[PDB]
Design a protein around this ligand. Structure first.
Ligand SMILES: [K+]
Ligand SMILES: [K+]
Ligand SMILES: [K+]
Ligand SMILES: [K+]
Ligand SMILES: [K+]
Ligand SMILES: [K+]
Ligand SMILES: [K+]
Ligand SMILES: [Mg+2]
Ligand SMILES: [Mg+2]
Ligand SMILES: [Mg+2]
Ligand SMILES: [Mg+2]
Ligand SMILES: [Mg+2]
Ligand SMILES: [Mg+2]
Ligand SMILES: [Mg+2]
Ligand SMILES: [Mg+2]
Ligand SMILES: [Mg+2]
Ligand SMILES: [Mg+2]
Ligand SMILES: [Mg+2]
Ligand SMILES: [Mg+2]
Ligand SMILES: [Mg+2]
Ligand SMILES: [Mg+2]
Ligand SMILES: [Mg+2]
Ligand SMILES: [Mg+2]
Ligand SMILES: [Mg+2]
Ligand SMILES: [Mg+2]
Ligand SMILES: [Mg+2]
Ligand SMILES: [Mg+2]
Ligand SMILES: [Mg+2]
Ligand SMILES: [Mg+2]
Ligand SMILES: [Mg+2]
Ligand SMILES: [Mg+2]
Ligand SMILES: [Mg+2]
Ligand SMILES: [Mg+2]
Ligand SMILES: [Mg+2]
Ligand SMILES: [Mg+2]
Ligand SMILES: [Mg+2]
Ligand SMILES: [Mg+2]
Lengths: 99, 203, 141, 50, 200
RNA sequence: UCCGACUUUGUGAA
RNA sequence: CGAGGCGCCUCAACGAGUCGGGUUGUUUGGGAAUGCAGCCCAAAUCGGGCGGUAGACUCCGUCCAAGGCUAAAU
RNA sequence: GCGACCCCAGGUCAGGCGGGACUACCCGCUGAGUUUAAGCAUAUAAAUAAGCGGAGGAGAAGAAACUUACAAGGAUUCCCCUAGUAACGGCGAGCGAACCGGGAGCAGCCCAGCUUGAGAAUCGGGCGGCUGUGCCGUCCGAAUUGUAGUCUGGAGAGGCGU
């Protein structure tokens, strides 16, 4: 949303072309829980339960070992970014169960 | 629409429900031949996305293939060559197990044509796939404009030329741009293009 | 062309110009650049110092177009000004990018006449030479 | 047996000439057609050409 | 190797002689391509032989920043601003590229203008004797409708050369163009350290 | 060929 | 002789033992790992895959895999 | 005992499909060594020869989980250039592409998922008729563990008007 300073070197370093706002595209909504897919996923979760590695994460979070939970999720899922997301879901399941 | 519920359940393979149901099925497949015709897909929702329809002309087979790597089949583990080529045991087949299963089915059923296959089970020594095949001589297939293409002669034995979904996986066609440009049109076509000595008439 | 080759002048002469003692054999000395550190070391050291070893850092996926900076010297700037524009000249203003140039360098003498130069880049001496002639520089992109 | 150096198809058959040099040659061959002595030297019978 | 030569690097250690590509079919390829162009021209008699209309784009990368060329097709936003439905555009000789986007206004306007110039030159034949359709042309316009060859709408590569005559003011001088280039480079390389100190 | 880990691999008692 | 286009305004579903990670082998110009394969682990939906040096954090650019067909230039 | 289904068995049952051949080009697997390194083991020969399969008049690929870093481009294929370059390599011998740019030629589509329930609206076969590569009628069957139609992210559904 910012035009460049026309200098060929520096922070912006480019030709000035009076930029415009890009319109929304359908693919902007990818990976977005809409409805009725969360419902189906949530219903299957209570029918199926939790994987044993997910339970091991949950018991680690109950005793406050949040760093040990991240290392177990990293071992299982293989990626730090996925481990962070999986721990957050595990914490929310405890948070929802808290009420 | 119940297909989403079925699909979501099959994503939880480690639940008590799926583990029990898969364990009983895995036992029963072990008492059957390695190539068995079934009257109905076990995973109908997974079959819909891969092209299966509940019509006369679509048939489903369960194929059992052995797990593990590819030992070099030389008479005593003896190689006559340089030590770079002396390995025997820890080598790997270049095609996946899914393509091996549908290639066995194609050889057994020459009158049919493989659509694709999906994973079904495994224990330790066997992997199970269900392969969808089409009877391209049936009028229901010949009159359906969405499956008519399979009746044309250029699609004969596509499982043997690496043209199914499993074949595109091991051919390196499940990615684009750099990291995959050497696989198009094929790796051998790419290699031949780079070996050419172009001797123009005005050089 | 075969008629002018020296092999045609050596017909009837036994060894074809290769000697009776040190004959023409297949590969005495090896093939290609063989032995460049063992029996061809003097040749490699004398005519190609620098050949072996590793200096500098690697650049994975080094695209040439990133380093594309064509340059032009001040001594050539006035050839881009047409005759009728110089007669009218106030100073002509030349955008060297319209002639395929990025940076202006300062080799050679400018005439003692003002000129305005538009460029993405310029050296310090080229700028000093342009200002000494009564001209100016405008930085563009 | 087999020929010593068997003739291959990737010999250089066609030859490149600079476009400018080709135009110079044509202009030089065009001007030679106007002096009658060089035409006779080529064997043309032009004794009765006006 | 015996004298002061270059170090030889001949890539001829494989079976290169089974992969020699000669070009003795080059004049035959030229005739086959010419013949198909004439057959294609007769197959579409009034339609232009140069294909559908193309937009104007900047070549990417810093080496070719300043050159314009033909793109693949017009954006969905350009067609909407010119009034041409995206389903109609391919059928009347306009290329559509749903992948491309419009990030700057000037690139977009020049392409919209290009479509308007094309629409003033396009002559549409009714799909029947009755001209019940709206976009069709008058009988006079159809009565003289020939086939154009080559590029009916050329693309200009690069900004046209133009040496202007200007008065050099006192602010045009003493601008210190080299100093500006160096200070802006410094501001770039000092940005991370400046932001670190600012956070602390 | 021996040897260890994982997989095949489930259930309940102290 | 109804449907589509266009102007305006609340839902919007998109492919799983698959992706991805580890390791082993092979292959590549791809170098803390280019593709592929076996085995082990094993996903997500304010998400996922890339930006040619492994890592964490903050921004930015860019795409949407795991179903299918497709002339021409060769 | 009469029944409904599931799984399976046997048929010289009615109608159909497959196997082999060819090698120039094309698709898949499998896979050396001679050779070079003036020795040789990694490397090279070569992801080649041989070996086992699969097609067509072309094949394969193909419509971005692509590039880039630009004022950004926009499916596949082929040519020129990139370029003997980045990289790789007892960093030895050697090896070695891609992006941009210019050409040839250009074209984008179909599904699954929620989406008949005021009516499986879909399909095949037997028989009969005809205007006959098909259409209609009737009777059986397939199919609800889903045929048809709508929809495919560039969207789309729904609502309101040309
Ligand atoms: K000699
Ligand atoms: K020399
Ligand atoms: K040729
Ligand atoms: K969808
Ligand atoms: K690897
Ligand atoms: K992202
Ligand atoms: K009937
Ligand atoms: Mg002698
Ligand atoms: Mg000698
Ligand atoms: Mg001697
Ligand atoms: Mg060789
Ligand atoms: Mg692996
Ligand atoms: Mg490895
Ligand atoms: Mg191999
Ligand atoms: Mg980077
Ligand atoms: Mg997908
Ligand atoms: Mg697809
Ligand atoms: Mg295809
Ligand atoms: Mg042709
Ligand atoms: Mg019979
Ligand atoms: Mg055959
Ligand atoms: Mg040797
Ligand atoms: Mg020797
Ligand atoms: Mg030896
Ligand atoms: Mg062979
Ligand atoms: Mg034939
Ligand atoms: Mg094809
Ligand atoms: Mg798309
Ligand atoms: Mg490209
Ligand atoms: Mg060069
Ligand atoms: Mg090589
Ligand atoms: Mg290429
Ligand atoms: Mg280009
Ligand atoms: Mg049935
Ligand atoms: Mg439906
Ligand atoms: Mg609709
Ligand atoms: Mg509407």
């Amino acid at each position: 949303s910012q035009p460049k300073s026309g200098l060929f070197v520096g922070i912006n370093k480019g030709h000035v072309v009076t930029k415009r706002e890009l319109p929304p595209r359908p693919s902007d909504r990818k990976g977005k829980g809409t409805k009725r897919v969360h419902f189906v996923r949530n219903l299957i979760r209570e029918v199926a339960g939790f994987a044993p590695y997910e339970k091991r994460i949950t018991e680690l979070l109950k005793v406050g070992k949040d760093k040990r939970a991240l290392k177990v999720a990293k071992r299982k899922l293989g990626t730090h970014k996925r481990a962070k997301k999986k721990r957050e879901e595990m914490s929310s399941v405890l948070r929802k169960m808290r009420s | 629409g119940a297909y989403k519920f079925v699909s979501e359940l099959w994503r939880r393979k480690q639940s008590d429900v799926m583990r029990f149901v898969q364990r009983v099925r895995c036992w029963e497949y072990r008492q059957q031949p390695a190539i068995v015709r079934i009257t109905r897909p076990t995973r109908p929702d997974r079959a819909r996305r891969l092209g299966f329809k509940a019509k006369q002309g679509y048939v489903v087979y369960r194929i059992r293939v052995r797990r593990g790597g590819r030992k070099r089949p030389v008479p005593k583990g003896i190689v006559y060559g340089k030590p770079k080529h002396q390995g025997i045991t820890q080598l790997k087949f270049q095609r996946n197990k899914r393509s091996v299963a549908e290639e066995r089915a194609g050889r057994r059923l020459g009158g049919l044509r493989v659509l694709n296959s999906y994973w079904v089970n495994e224990d330790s020594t066997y992997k199970y796939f269900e392969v969808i095949l089409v009877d391209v001589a049936h009028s229901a297939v010949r009159n359906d404009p969405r499956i008519n293409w399979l009746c044309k002669p250029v699609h004969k034995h596509r499982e043997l030329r690496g043209l199914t979904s499993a074949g595109k996986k091991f051919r390196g066609l499940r990615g684009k741009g750099h990291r995959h440009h050497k696989n198009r049109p094929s790796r051998r076509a790419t290699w031949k293009r780079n070996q050419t000595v172009s001797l123009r008439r005005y050089r | 062309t075969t008629r002018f080759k020296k092999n045609r002048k050596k017909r009837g002469h036994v060894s074809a110009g290769h000697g009776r003692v040190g004959k023409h054999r297949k590969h005495p000395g090896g093939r290609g650049n063989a032995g460049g550190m063992h029996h061809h070391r003097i040749l490699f050291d004398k005519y190609h110092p620098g050949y072996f070893g590793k200096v500098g850092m690697r650049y994975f996926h080094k695209l040439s177009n990133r380093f594309y900076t064509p340059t032009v010297n001040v001594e050539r700037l006035w050839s881009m000004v047409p005759s009728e524009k110089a007669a009218e000249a106030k100073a002509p203003v030349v955008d060297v990018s319209q002639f395929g140039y990025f940076k202006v360098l300062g080799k050679g003498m400018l005439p003692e006449k003002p000129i305005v130069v538009k460029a993405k880049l310029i050296s310090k001496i080229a700028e000093k030479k342009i200002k000494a002639a009564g001209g100016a520089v405008v930085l563009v992109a | 047996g087999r020929m010593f150096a068997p003739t291959k198809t990737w010999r250089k058959w066609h030859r490149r000439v600079n476009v400018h040099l080709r135009r110079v040659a044509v202009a030089s061959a065009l001007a030679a057609t106007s002096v009658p002595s060089l035409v006779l030297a080529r064997g043309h019978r032009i004794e009765t050409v006006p | 190797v015996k004298h002061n030569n270059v170090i030889p690097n001949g890539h001829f250690k494989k079976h290169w002689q089974n992969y020699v590509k000669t070009w003795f079919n080059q004049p035959a390829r030229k005739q086959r391509r010419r013949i198909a162009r004439q057959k294609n021209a007769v197959k579409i008699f009034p339609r232009p032989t140069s294909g559908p209309l193309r937009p104007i784009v900047q070549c990417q990368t810093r080496k070719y920043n300043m050159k314009a060329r033909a793109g693949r097709g017009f954006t969905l936003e350009e067609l909407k601003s010119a009034g041409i439905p995206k389903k109609l555009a391919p059928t009347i000789g306009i290329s559509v590229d749903h992948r491309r986007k419009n990030r700057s206004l000037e690139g977009m306007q020049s392409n919209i203008q290009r479509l308007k110039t094309y629409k003033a030159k396009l002559v549409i034949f009714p799909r029947r004797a009755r001209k019940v359709k709206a976009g069709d042309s008058t009988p006079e316009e159809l009565a003289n409708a020939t086939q154009v060859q080559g590029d009916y709408m050329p693309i200009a590569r690069g900004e046209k050369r133009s040496v202007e005559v200007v008065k050099v003011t006192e602010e045009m001088k003493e601008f210190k163009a080299y100093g500006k280039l160096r200070v802006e480079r410094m501001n770039q390389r000092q940005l991370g350290a400046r932001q670190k100190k600012a956070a602390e």
